[PDB]
């Protein structure tokens, strides 16, 4: 039993109410070291299609408890590997556990997580996402985002109707003129619809700076074709769930940018995807699922600490109505500001 032994692992459901979708059914992970330093991680399972649940996630963390109790948090990378070998499919569970262990490690040695990952910056500039409505409400959202002091915006499109999608973009670009536009196609386009969408954006000089996952993951060839021909930077999200995916992307030119979501791969795997990306000269985006200031501030500590991320998409704290946390990043406008604080800097409220 030395100061960095794990004597306590606990997981509890956290249901965080949202402003406009209803609840982020997430899990708070706590690891406690023998010296009393506490590390916090968050699991955010998103059950779309073949997904994980809050209930399945908590149960996975309870199963993984016996594998970490009594172990030295100092073997963080070894422990991350054995979690992945025992419970690969519970990505959100392993992410929260990895976040917690690293938080504990760095808080123990009094080191900021952004310094542990590289120390390049203490500041990120995030976009903000437009909800839905119609063409009228999207123009109003575009104006509302830029009035908050946020430079770039993210828009979700359905991809089934090029004409409607374009009309939404026109409005948004007209309403918010100096905003770089990141467009999340959410696997909805095919090659023809993606190319025709891009061609029109170019023709109208619509400032899309990223076309995010326009096609389904399985259309590897189509993804590559859009990447090669469209004249826009393309991001891989669903196509990028592992380091193996990222090697494939680099090889086939599947996309030109990787959206890292630590919730989907875990931390150690995400670290390898970053290094593959940077060495292939792919751009890096950092995003998340429906996550509180906890998981988001961890992701922010990595993006800022590593360096080299051109796209920051860490805006879900602005959509959470309330939560039990203090600290983390400090947002002013679209600027996320990090501090001379050990770990990720997010803590639980007192009273």
Chain positions 170 to 209 lying near K ion, rule: CB under 5 A, are: none
Q: Are 145 and 130 in contact (CB under 8 A)?
A: yes
Rounded to a whole number of angstroms, the CA Rg of the chain reads 20
Burial 32-69 (b: 16+ CB within 10 A, else e): bbbeebbbbbbbbbbeeeeebebebbbebbeebeebbe
**Cβ-Cβ contacts under 8 Å for 78 (sequence gap 6 or more):** none
The answer to the question of whether 212 is labelled as a binding residue is yes
- Least Å distance, CB 290 to K ion, is 11
320 to 339, contacts with K ion by CB under 5 A?
Answer: none
Q: Which is nearer to K ion, 316 or 331 (CB)?
A: 316
Is 315 annotated in some ligand binding site? Answer: yes
Give the number of residues in contact with K ion, rule: CB under 5 A: 1
Closest by Cα among 169, 174, 175 to 147: 175
Q: Tell me how far, at minimum, the Cβ of 201 lies from K ion, in Å.
A: 19
Smallest gap from residue 241 Cβ to K ion (A): 12
Any idea of the CA torsion for 241, 243, 244, 247, to the nearest 10 degrees?
A: 110
Question: 219 or 237: whose CB is closer to K ion?
Answer: 237
- The size of the chain, in residues, is 351
Per-residue x/- track, 222-251, K ion (CB under 5 A): ---------------x--------------
Please report how close the Cβ of residue 260 comes to K ion at its closest, in angstroms. Answer: 11
**Is residue 161 annotated as involved in ligand binding?**
no
Distance CA 42, CA 63 (A): 17
Is 190 annotated as belonging to a binding site?
A: no
Which residue's Cβ lies closest to K ion?
237
Q: Is 129 annotated as a binding residue?
A: yes
**Which C-beta is closer to K ion: that of 114 or that of 154?**
154
Q: Flag whether 314 is marked binding.
A: yes
Q: How far is the CB of 324 from K ion (least distance, A)?
A: 26
* Annotated binding-site members for Mg(2+): 184, 212, 237
Which residues contact K ion (rule: CB under 5 A)?
A: 237
């Amino acid at each position: 039993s030395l100061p960095t032994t794990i004597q306590a692992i606990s997981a509890e459901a956290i249901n965080l109410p949202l402003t406009e979708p209803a609840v982020a059914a997430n899990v708070l992970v706590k690891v406690q070291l023998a010296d009393g330093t506490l590390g916090l991680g968050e699991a955010a399972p998103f059950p779309a299609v073949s997904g994980e649940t809050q209930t399945g996630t908590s149960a996975a963390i309870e199963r993984l408890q016996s594998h970490l109790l009594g172990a030295d948090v100092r073997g963080w990378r070894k422990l991350a590997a054995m979690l992945d070998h025992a419970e690969h499919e519970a990505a959100a569970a392993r992410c929260g556990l990895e976040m917690a262990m690293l938080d504990a490690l760095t808080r123990h040695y009094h080191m900021p997580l952004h310094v542990f990952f590289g120390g390049v910056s203490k500041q990120l500039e995030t976009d903000m996402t437009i909800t839905a409505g119609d063409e009228v409400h999207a123009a109003a959202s575009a104006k509302a985002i830029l009035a908050r002091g946020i430079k770039s915006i993210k828009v979700k499109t359905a991809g089934v109707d090029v004409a409607y999608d374009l009309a939404r973009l026109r409005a948004i670009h007209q309403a918010a003129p100096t905003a770089p536009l990141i467009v999340d196609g959410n696997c909805g386009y095919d090659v023809e619809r993606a190319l025709a969408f891009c061609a029109a954006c170019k023709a109208e000089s619509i400032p899309m700076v990223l076309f995010e996952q326009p096609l389904p993951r399985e259309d590897w060839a189509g993804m590559a074709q859009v990447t090669a021909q469209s004249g826009f930077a393309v991001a891989a999200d669903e196509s990028a769930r592992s380091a193996h995916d990222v090697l494939r992307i680099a090889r086939e030119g599947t996309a030109s940018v990787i959206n890292i979501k630590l919730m989907k791969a875990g931390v150690a795997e995400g670290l390898k995807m970053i290094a593959i990306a940077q060495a292939a000269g792919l751009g890096l985006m950092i995003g998340g699922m429906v996550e509180s200031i906890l998981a988001m501030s961890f992701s922010a500590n990595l993006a800022a600490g590593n360096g080299g991320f051109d796209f920051i998409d860490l805006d879900t704290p602005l959509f959470i109505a309330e939560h039990p946390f203090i600290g983390g990043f400090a947002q002013t406008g679209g600027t996320l500001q990090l501090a001379d604080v050990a770990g990720h800097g997010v803590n639980l409220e007192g009273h």
